[PDB]
Structure formats: C-alpha cells, structure tokens
C-alpha cells in the first residue's frame, strides 16, 4: 500500500536502470521492489546469511553510506531510499 509517488535522484535512478527500470517516476513500492531485485541480481547478499547485504564495492554502498547492512534495518532502508528521491507534489 506504499503508493507514495516519487522521482529518484540520479544515483538511485542508476541502480534502477540496472534491473531494467528506466522511467523517471515510480511508486515507492516499485522502488523498493526494484532495489530488492538489484541486490538479488548483483548477488550482494551473503549466500549463508541472506539478510546481510555487503555493498561496500557496489554503487549501492554510495546510496546507503555504509559497507554493509541488514535487511532487518527497515527504518534505515526507508530512510536512505527516501533521502535519494523526491516525493512528487501531485500524489495519486
């Protein structure tokens, strides 16, 4: 139900392009889903402890500002994604 209309900033947009998403405006749900696919396809999660993402050597690490994080860190994830987009004035 995360329907917030958003326009990713250049870094986030580059990440989205990696999984085939080239539009400029998204729902938050879409951004979140595509970032999950990004992590999957770049194989940035630990194969033995899959909630751990190791992003130091990936562009994702520039977004999050840390070398690693857990998918359990929901507030941090949301926070870092929102700071990398602009919420659209006209919602809906």
């Amino acid at each position: 139900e995360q329907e917030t209309l958003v326009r990713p900033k250049p870094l986030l947009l580059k990440l989205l392009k990696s999984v085939g998403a080239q539009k400029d405006t998204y729902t938050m749900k879409e951004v979140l889903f595509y970032l999950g696919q990004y992590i999957m396809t770049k194989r940035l999660y630990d194969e033995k402890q899959q909630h751990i993402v190791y992003c130091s050597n990936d562009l994702l690490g520039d977004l999050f500002g840390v070398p690693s994080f857990s998918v359990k860190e929901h507030r941090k994830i949301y926070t870092m994604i929102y700071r990398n987009l602009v919420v659209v004035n006209q919602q809906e």
């Binding site: 979140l32 999950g36 899959q50």
Partner: peptide, 10 residues
C-alpha cells in the same frame, strides 16, 4: 533465498 521487505527473491 533473498528476503526483502514484502518480497522474496529466491
């Protein structure tokens, strides 16, 4: 096997 928020990616 990668779980993320509302979704599962293997």
């Amino acid at each position: 096997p990668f779980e993320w928020l509302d979704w599962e990616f293997x």
